[PDB]
Write a protein that binds this ligand. Structure first.
Ligand SMILES: OC[C@H]1O[C@@H](O[C@H]2[C@H](O)[C@H](O)[C@H](O[C@@H]3[C@H](O)[C@H](O[C@H]4[C@H](O)[C@H](O)[C@H](O)O[C@@H]4CO)O[C@H](CO)[C@H]3O)O[C@@H]2CO)[C@@H](O)[C@@H](O)[C@@H]1O
Length: 223
């Protein structure tokens, strides 16, 4: 690959995108490893993959390696007109306990650290094994032309909304503002007080492997 990132928090940035080998929960594993690899990048999007094996810590996330879209701090959610994104990905085996998910943090403080926020929005395009989102499911919702099981919970003082696809969506073209709109008018989410902190796509790895997730394309367009 063009770039290989095997260290915890190994980082690449280019073309308005970034990759982080974000092995934040590796201390929960009894054994394992993970690397992320850049295959290509342009202003129109990036291609990357990650390979991993993790054992132990059955219900603990070991990592959420991701590609992130970069943008200026200070964008209030209600000031954002569109948060379109396109992704195509595939796992080489589904015999893993892992998900594929977008992760978005928002915070009243526009300069909030990138590792959390006041609120978290996850969109799970796939769920392999018995792994569960934070909190409890509240029912099925229709957002951006598709149905999702909505889970709501707390991670410390951070409120987490997770939208779960009913079957794996290997190719997805989404408008993430529709999810914020849904939360603003159905879950009391204070969109006018919140700023965008991160916008990421990746995989939460729990156990299994060796396995590879290939992202044939990732792009996002915020305006
Ligand atoms: O940006 C470059 C610098 O990276 C730094 O490492 C940061 C890194 O940027 C990561 O984004 C990481 O954030 C962690 C996770 O993303 C995770 O988010 C969890 C979240 O808690 C939710 O509950 C949800 O369910 O899942 C997501 C994804 O699993 O949360 C963990 C724990 O709070 C975050 O740490 O943080 C890294 C470490 O700070 C630096 O390493 C620096 O060197 C780079 O320049």
């Amino acid at each position: 690959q063009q770039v290989t990132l095997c260290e915890q928090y190994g980082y690449w940035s280019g073309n308005g995108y970034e990759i982080n080998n974000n092995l934040w929960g590796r201390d929960s594993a009894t054994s394992g490893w993970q690397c992320s690899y850049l295959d290509g990048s342009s202003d129109s999007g990036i291609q990357w993959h990650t390979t991993w094996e993790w054992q132990g810590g059955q219900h603990d996330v070991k990592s959420y390696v991701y590609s992130g879209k970069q943008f200026p701090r200070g964008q209030r959610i209600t000031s954002i007109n569109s948060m379109q994104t396109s992704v195509s990905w595939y796992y080489d085996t589904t015999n893993v306990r892992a998900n594929v998910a977008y992760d978005i943090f928002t915070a009243a403080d526009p300069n909030h650290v990138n590792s959390s926020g006041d609120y978290e929005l996850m969109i799970w395009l796939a769920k392999y094994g018995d792994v569960q989102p934070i909190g409890s499911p509240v029912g099925t919702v229709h957002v951006n032309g598709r149905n999702w099981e909505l889970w709501i919970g707390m991670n410390g003082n951070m409120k987490v909304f997770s939208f779960i696809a009913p079957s794996p969506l290997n190719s997805w073209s989404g408008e993430v503002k529709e999810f914020f709109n849904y939360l603003q008018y159905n879950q009391g989410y204070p969109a006018g007080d919140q700023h965008l902190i991160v916008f990421q796509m990746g995989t939460e790895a729990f156990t299994g492997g060796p396995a590879t997730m290939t992202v044939s394309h990732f792009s996002a367009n915020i305006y």
